[PDB]
Write a protein that binds this ligand. Sequence first.
Ligand SMILES: O=N[O-]
Ligand SMILES: O=N[O-]
Ligand SMILES: O=N[O-]
Ligand SMILES: [Cu+2]
Ligand SMILES: [Cu+2]
Ligand SMILES: [Cu+2]
Ligand SMILES: [Cu+2]
Ligand SMILES: [Cu+2]
Ligand SMILES: [Cu+2]
Lengths: 333, 333, 333
Amino acid sequence: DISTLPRVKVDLVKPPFVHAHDQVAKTGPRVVEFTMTIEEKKLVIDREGTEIHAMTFNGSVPGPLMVVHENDYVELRLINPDTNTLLHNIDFHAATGALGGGALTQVNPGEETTLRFKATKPGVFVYHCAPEGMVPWHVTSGMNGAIMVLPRDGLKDEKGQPLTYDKIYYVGEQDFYVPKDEAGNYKKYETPGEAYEDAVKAMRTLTPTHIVFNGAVGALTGDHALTAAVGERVLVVHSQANRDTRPHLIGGHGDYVWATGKFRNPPDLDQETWLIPGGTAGAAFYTFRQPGVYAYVNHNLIEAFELGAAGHFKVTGEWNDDLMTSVVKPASM
Amino acid sequence: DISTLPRVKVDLVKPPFVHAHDQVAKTGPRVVEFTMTIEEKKLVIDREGTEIHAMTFNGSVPGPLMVVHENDYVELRLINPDTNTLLHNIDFHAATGALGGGALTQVNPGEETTLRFKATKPGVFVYHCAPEGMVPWHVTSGMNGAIMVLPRDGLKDEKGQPLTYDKIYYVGEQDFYVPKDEAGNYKKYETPGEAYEDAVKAMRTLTPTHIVFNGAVGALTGDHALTAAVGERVLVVHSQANRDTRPHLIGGHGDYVWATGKFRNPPDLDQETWLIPGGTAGAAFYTFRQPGVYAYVNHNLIEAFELGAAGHFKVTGEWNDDLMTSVVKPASM
Amino acid sequence: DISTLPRVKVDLVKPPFVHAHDQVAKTGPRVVEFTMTIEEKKLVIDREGTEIHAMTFNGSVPGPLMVVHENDYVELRLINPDTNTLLHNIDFHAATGALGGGALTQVNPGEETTLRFKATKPGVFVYHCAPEGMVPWHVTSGMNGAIMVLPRDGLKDEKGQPLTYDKIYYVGEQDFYVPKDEAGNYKKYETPGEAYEDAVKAMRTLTPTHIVFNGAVGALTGDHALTAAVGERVLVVHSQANRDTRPHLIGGHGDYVWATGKFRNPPDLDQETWLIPGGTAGAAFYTFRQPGVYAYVNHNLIEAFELGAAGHFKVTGEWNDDLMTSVVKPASM
Ligand SMILES: O=N[O-]
Ligand SMILES: O=N[O-]
Ligand SMILES: O=N[O-]
Ligand SMILES: [Cu+2]
Ligand SMILES: [Cu+2]
Ligand SMILES: [Cu+2]
Ligand SMILES: [Cu+2]
Ligand SMILES: [Cu+2]
Ligand SMILES: [Cu+2]
């Protein structure tokens, strides 16, 4: 009887940070209550000032990472304020039935709904908007995020021993299809419905104009670089709701990788690069061994360094010359 | 001595249905006799009336699913009637030697051939036409299907216990490269050889104009939706002879997935989405838990909902409110 | 103390051949000394005479395969002669820290450097040039190769028994983005810096003009086909530094495949086709069972047969009619 279970309210935080949670469940099954408010907003996605109408869950691209344990219930209050202009809904790939919830959560501006589902399968999963006849348009406008369903006993390695992360980050990777004039210039629009009328043609090229982490070129750099210390164990959750990606930590590895995101499977070990299919979340565990700057990319390096799918870590601590050293620094002899 | 083995004739059926077979082999090794007749035909592939010259095995795109057991012999009589205009052949990815059979099966219009191979490796496998110098042209004209080579003791899970499907469907996914005029309009042609003269340029864009299940937009919808009941175990075989895909059951999962199709490997569990590389067949097992409409897509949602890679299931039975429920239906308060 | 370890000098050889090595380490950990000299050169990449400025490690596309054992030290002397025009560096995906070495190895024309790293993780790994702000440009100009880090006890199967190859080949697969005039004709240039000024636009299409093995259309055919004998065990290492590929041996299989290249994981069995993500090396083991010609392709067959990602094996020995036979040769009846 679900009414006899504990209810716990969670306040979500902005990616790439993740709300506070316990890896090992410290209670029995609960009803975990989340509220997300839909926001349509203009977003500047590149250094050039290119502007799109973003369709967001909770004001961000990606939407926030939700975290529960296996056989908890997710209870989502989804709010579509009348300041928005479109009909939206939500499909959880973690959920079973009703198109992942999409059939039950269609909210017009001025409406709200509350969906409950049982998180029966452990892993990281995409969630995304999916309105009939407008699915790729909403998704590729940024209206996607992810949910992590932890095993009740936390994460385990390929031999059944614990893997405990010290830090967790959520990297949402977004393909955008910004329409262009005949010369190749990106268009801007006053409303989402104006933007929509060039969108299907732009999408049908299957060629993104931009591919970004955390909603913009350079978003996970500078004052917003990801951080760690030598010795720290970091889980990087990575989603792509519409298009394949191939994450890579430049100067590191994925020590343990669930490339298709599902924790009942043993992780792949020692990955350089892994394929997260479009429509999937994956997760990589790494223990930092060297200080300094790292880049974290989609390893189609064009997509990374030209189209925006690149962020940075800044890592503190002790350089290990056994692991790597410059024997003779660059010089002319 | 192959001449001392039983011979069994199989009459093939039209995808997405699959000929009758036993999961667990009820006889010893056999010679399993199949006949396929090549048919070049005009095919309307979209709602707009776009017409291509399809190059088919047995009149369908995809060709039919053949089913045998490990260490059976496949004996295929391949017929190229003189009503056709091109030279064709067949390459089985299940087979060993002679370019999968392609080197031994070149048939002009008016010719037939009979190939035998031993199905030494269990899994689902692509088969496709592959005439020297015209390989992608034939494949991307629809001239591909798949063969399932079951283990003699049936399918097994990640721990060695039986997996028994109640229903099986074969989803062939086809990328087409329909040539366009300068404005973007799709061309039509009177013969395959006329179509060929714009084909290499269209293909070289690496950008399909259409991506369809069972040979057309909407083919696996309406009166041709796939069906199941709550509680039924369904195996969905999925092939793509030329281009990567990423299948996803909207509102379900792949409970057990062989994403690259080979049953000696333990399946991946609880997948949301999986990558079937171009040139591969994969297979997903799911037990339905909720009634209603599902969509089954390539989860590049542009490819799905704009280019045609989407079908439906209609599932009968009992809604499970523990698994999912609308707590507050969409409303304005 | 690294100074107390043996030093062994290796002279590299031209792909697809691989320098001599021991599968099972016959010494303790060593410092393995490699020298590579950077060469910018014009390269003809197709039958039509299309010419690019290749940026090479050691004169070849791909660069040579380096081979060491787990917990050896790689010590690379990287030489950038003043006959070159650009600044280059090297990132080892096998290495830990300093952007895989890229931060420590920036060499102007006329300079050299020596990097040492510990090969702590077994597998095949990409290495590539990666100069800040010019990364995809160098990589897609051919400036990438691979390194194999063998387990000290050699390769093992999915059950822990030895896998010993008789032959090894290295297939580097290169995506090129040759700029075109308005009609679609490929441009030529007198220097790399001239070529660079059309390069970012060509790359941003995400549509290669050419996709080749061993640096040119047809490079692994004719007098340069790969060779084997029936019964021989062959390891094919395959890398793609920038873009996904899907290798396939036409008329064979990958009996044991590490599709993402890392030997601590059990191989996938009996693969028809596998996905090597861009930014990765993979490795497939096969025992030949049939003589004759094979093709080895990227199984996007357009990429293979139109854009150049196809090579051949010529295999000697005994045809096995149990495995495959023509029962009735093509004929009209
Ligand atoms: O090595 N990462 O580009
Ligand atoms: O959740 N499937 O689009
Ligand atoms: O069967 N290989 O194209
Ligand atoms: Cu929406
Ligand atoms: Cu989805
Ligand atoms: Cu054909
Ligand atoms: Cu093939
Ligand atoms: Cu370089
Ligand atoms: Cu890299």
